[PDB]
Structure 1
Amino acid sequence: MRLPDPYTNPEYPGLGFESVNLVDNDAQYWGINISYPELFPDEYAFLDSRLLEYKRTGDYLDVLLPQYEAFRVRGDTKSVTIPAGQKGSQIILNTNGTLTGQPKAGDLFKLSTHPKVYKITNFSSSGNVWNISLYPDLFITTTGSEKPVFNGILFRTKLMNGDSFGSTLNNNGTYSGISLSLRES
């Protein structure tokens, strides 16, 4: 299930995060700490209903972190190839001349076929050959059918603080201190 935000639900601008911390837990997994601004009753009720549905159905929570949305690499990834049999800390790909721009160390990365999110540690190229160094090491050996993902990356997580989720209506008619602690699953 997608954690609702102002992109899925622009009617609730309060679902836009105030602060986000991406924590490295070293298999390696990312921890995500999200802090909300004060939420209006409709926003809080909608978020609460969506987290109750997540609790009811033992699903994951997919989350977009807009602070990593730099759109540094653009274009159609259809003819972009990732050769099979790769594992370790590097992903080599052939852009086929279809991608504009280049990624930077600190950017996120994901393979289209697997949920793991990586951090880019280094980038080098030789024409259409891109060499992207990743942290942590690849969770799978490539099959050759994967596509690189630079934008719109969703982290697949589980909620860690469901037992301390919630708030009470304050004197301003809003809900303060709402925060989500997520663990990449």
Structure 2
Amino acid sequence: MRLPDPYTNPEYPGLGFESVNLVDNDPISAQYWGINISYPELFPDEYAFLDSRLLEYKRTGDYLDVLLPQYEAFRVRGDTKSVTIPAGQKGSQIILNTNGTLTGQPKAGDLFKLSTHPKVYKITNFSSSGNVWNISLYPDLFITTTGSEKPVFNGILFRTKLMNGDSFGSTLNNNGTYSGISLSLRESLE
């Protein structure tokens, strides 16, 4: 379940977020991101759409994949598939070999994800030596690299669970829209 937005569904611009907060949970357990999405007033058809998607989400027990457009930095561009990430890596640093196919560089604060695993990281520092990139991450890597991972800097989806199904919804207001819709999502560690 991709959480529908104006990219997937440009016919519903209200599905653009009014506000989003990315929240750090550092438990006893592993770190996980919390996401709080607030919508502007939704019109009947876009509200009806989102409603039905969340319902389908409810009955199938799936995850919800979410894009946060605020993090569409596009500070790094190029052929990520020709990047090499050496095997055996763990901890808070991730080294990769760009093979000269990347342009630009990421900065502290940007998101990062491995192609083969759903966990999303924050980039905390970055240095390079020619085509060698040294990306410092938070939290530590959830897996040891296999050698087949590719870096993801843009179009990162968080794999989440809805926390507030029981307070989701609104009723028609006096200008024929639905106010106060917000979603509270928790990154799911499988």
TM-score calculated relative to the size of structure 2: 0.97
How far off is 1:181 after superposition? 0.1
How far off is 1:79 after superposition? 1.6
| Distance in structure 2 (CA, Å) of the matches to 1:139 and 1:106 | 19
**Which residue number corresponds to residue 124 of structure 1?**
127
Query: Which secondary structure does the structure 1 equivalent of 2:81 belong to?
Result: coil
1:47-78: CA deviation from partner (whole Å, max 9, x where unpaired): 00000000010000000000000100000112
1:144-182: CA deviation from partner (whole Å, max 9, x where unpaired): 000000000000000000000000000000000000000
| Distance in structure 1 (CA, Å) of the matches to 2:41 and 2:77 | 35
Query: Which secondary structure does the structure 2 equivalent of 1:182 belong to?
Result: strand
**Which residue number corresponds to residue 23 of structure 2?**
23
**Which residue number corresponds to residue 54 of structure 1?**
57
How far off is 1:13 after superposition? 0.1
1:98-127: CA deviation from partner (whole Å, max 9, x where unpaired): 000000000000000000000000000000
How far off is 1:90 after superposition? 0.4
| Distance in structure 2 (CA, Å) of the matches to 1:182 and 1:131 | 30
| Distance in structure 1 (CA, Å) of the matches to 2:185 and 2:174 | 29
Q: Higher mean Cα deviation, 72-81 or 29-38? A: 72-81
**Structure 1 residue 11 and structure 2 residue 14: aligned?**
no
Query: Which secondary structure does the structure 2 equivalent of 1:34 belong to?
Result: strand
1:20-69: CA deviation from partner (whole Å, max 9, x where unpaired): 00000000000000000000000000000000000010000000000000
User: What percentage of aligned pairs have identical amino acids?
Assistant: 100
> What stretches of structure 2 of length at least 5 have no aligned partner?
none
**Which residue number corresponds to residue 116 of structure 2?**
113
| Distance in structure 1 (CA, Å) of the matches to 2:12 and 2:82 | 37
Cα RMSD between the aligned structures?
0.3
Q: Higher mean Cα deviation, 6-15 or 72-81? A: 72-81
Q: How many residues align?
A: 185
TM-score calculated relative to the size of structure 1: 1.00
> What stretches of structure 1 of length at least 5 have no aligned partner?
none
